[PDB]
């Protein structure tokens, strides 16, 4: 009566280790990743359903620890700048500036070690205001002198995002859901199977989500709990909004030897006038896109609810501004110029600041020093979504953001990992 079958098409939810596939020694060691399967076959599954939960998806946790581990490994074999944490003697940069840049740059002189242990040299460099702390012309310290070590990033290792594909080991499969009305949880009927996902760009940002995937059928609004004001709301656009960012100053760079075999890259002088860094967003596009978000957002509050976007909530720059990583520079842009409307029933210019000393993972640990880059940086990118948080007829939303194990969460919401279980039994009418 008992017949044993092998190769039965069933599975259980499971957690396993995923490995990557992809495609000059960049920050994510993509040359160490296996080659992709070109033209992989996607297999649609007819007459199946499955349940998903993007807020409990362990693929997010692996992407989180993979990116952090890679960041730290890549910065490990790089020159330390410990000898640079000295008393600095600084004055203001005033010779060729606009008023908006007055006080933004400082000219600092200091006594630094030469390759010979017994000799010192007088050198100077420029620093941005945000990296320099006054002690009492005036004496200064770098911002991390009493908190952590500063390591200079290696100049040969780039940071631009490179798509990384996550692949399951044999015996496991990835279920991708196509239901275009899926809100992040529960039954999601249009399921297909892939062995390895498409590439995801490991972009790190706050408030605005850049260079991600787009929605199609509608703007999607997803949250763990809509009525819980302690949770974030992820909004995915079905159209991109284009932005253009610039340095715009023409920078120079010089090397200082600080010991045998090691050098520090100092910001040199500036060619031409000094102007403030900034980002432009097309105004009409932003105006229309925001209206689409509101129409859809109202479905969870009522047709008589007024939606206001107020302003940024306040706090440290890392959580109040738009953290933008581009061209090898770290930008902190003022988004109050975007989120300024109330909804009832040209270009926008966002002034932006630059920092060289970066605490990338919002932790106390080794800080990275971004070496200066010569020439002029020009960045073009797509806003694919945004993060909102919510504070009796008017609801208030704010950019919020700042959370890690987010952003990537908007790319991995479509996937679940399952374990294949080939054996099973059933009754029939045979005997040996």
């Amino acid at each position: 009566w008992v017949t044993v079958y092998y190769g039965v098409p069933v599975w259980k939810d499971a957690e396993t280790t995923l490995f990557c596939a992809s495609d000059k020694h960049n920050v994510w060691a993509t040359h160490a990743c296996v080659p992709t399967d070109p033209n992989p076959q996607e297999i649609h599954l007819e007459n199946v359903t499955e349940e998903f939960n993007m807020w409990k998806n362990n693929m997010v946790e692996q992407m989180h620890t993979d990116i952090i581990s890679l960041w730290d490994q890549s910065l490990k074999p790089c020159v330390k700048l410990t000898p640079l944490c000295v008393t600095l003697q600084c004055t203001n940069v005033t010779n060729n500036i606009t008023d908006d840049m007055r006080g933004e740059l400082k000219n600092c002189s200091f006594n630094m070690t030469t390759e010979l242990r017994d000799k010192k040299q007088k050198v100077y460099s420029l620093f941005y205001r945000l990296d320099v702390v006054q002690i009492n012309n005036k004496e200064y310290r770098l911002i991390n002198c009493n908190t952590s070590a500063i390591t200079q990033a290696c100049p040969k290792v780039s940071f631009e995002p490179i798509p990384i594909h996550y692949c399951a080991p044999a015996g496991f499969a990835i279920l991708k859901c196509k239901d275009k009305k899926f809100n992040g949880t529960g039954p999601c009927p249009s399921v297909s199977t892939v062995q390895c996902t498409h590439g995801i760009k490991p972009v790190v940002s706050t408030q605005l989500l850049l260079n991600g995937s787009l929605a199609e059928e509608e703007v999607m609004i997803r949250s763990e709990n809509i009525t819980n004001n302690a949770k974030n709301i992820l909004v995915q656009f079905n159209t991109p909004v284009q932005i253009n960012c610039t340095r715009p100053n023409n920078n120079t760079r010089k090397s200082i030897r600080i010991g045998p075999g090691q050098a520090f890259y100092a910001t040199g002088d500036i060619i031409g006038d000094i102007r403030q860094a900034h980002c432009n967003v097309s105004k009409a596009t932003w105006n229309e896109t925001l209206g689409k978000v509101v129409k859809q957002l109202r479905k969870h509050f009522g047709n008589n609810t007024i939606i206001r976007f107020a302003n940024s909530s306040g706090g440290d720059l890392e959580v109040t501004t738009h953290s933008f990583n581009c061209g090898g520079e770290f930008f902190y842009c003022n988004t109050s110029g975007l989120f300024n409307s109330t909804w009832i029933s040209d270009s926008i210019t966002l002034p932006c600041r630059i920092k060289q000393i970066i605490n990338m993972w919002q932790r106390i640990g080794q800080a990275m020093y971004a070496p200066p880059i010569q020439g002029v940086i020009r960045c073009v990118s797509n806003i694919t979504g945004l993060i909102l948080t919510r504070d009796s007829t008017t609801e208030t939303f704010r950019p919020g953001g700042g959370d890690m194990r987010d952003n990537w969460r908007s790319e991995l919401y479509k996937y679940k990992v399952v374990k294949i279980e080939p054996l099973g039994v059933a009754p029939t009418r045979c005997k040996r």
Epitope: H44, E46, C177, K178, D179, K180, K181, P189, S190, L214, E216, E217, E218, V219, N238, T239, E288, K292, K295
Partner: antibody, heavy 113, light 109 residues
Amino acid sequence: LVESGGGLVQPGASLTLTCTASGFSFSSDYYMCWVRQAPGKGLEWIACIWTANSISYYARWAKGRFTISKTSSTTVTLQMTSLTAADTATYFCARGGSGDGQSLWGPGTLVTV
Amino acid sequence: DIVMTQTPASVEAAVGGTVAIKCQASQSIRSYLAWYQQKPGQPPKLLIYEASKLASGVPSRFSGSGSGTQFTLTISGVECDDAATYYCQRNYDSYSGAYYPNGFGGGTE
């Protein structure tokens, strides 16, 4: 909305129909769909295009013969090729949206092959 | 791919009596069935969407319900403005994941 085009053609001919917005524009949240109804028949579906990102879907019977596209913020067209006598029908455009049927229908056009 | 059959063909009733029209499918289309009314010479009017919701402009005599693969349109009483055929439209594509108005079954008065 409003519609235009149509007329008498011979088999092997191509004919393009045009439908346009009136009192509205092609904001993201709409589908422009084309359907057909022969004089003695019920409704048949041909194709739908989603305004954002110009994404189309087609009936299998229509594949390779009927092309649907967005040409402007107000205009959507249907290009029919390799027409035969069997394609004589009233053609209609209508506007729908996600999760629903078409709610806005125009007077149709007449195509005779 | 898409199977839609309207079965109670050629049903009519005297004014004051009632009628019902029903459709079946080989694939579930839960809560994604739309009903239309087509009077001669007119484009179809949307009556009911998402199985049970009435469209704006639709008289209270129209109603209906269903789920899965079994759905019905009902008329609470004939008012002599029912001289139309009715159609079933599917608003869900099980292969693409999209929810657009693809495919009809129908033709019953």
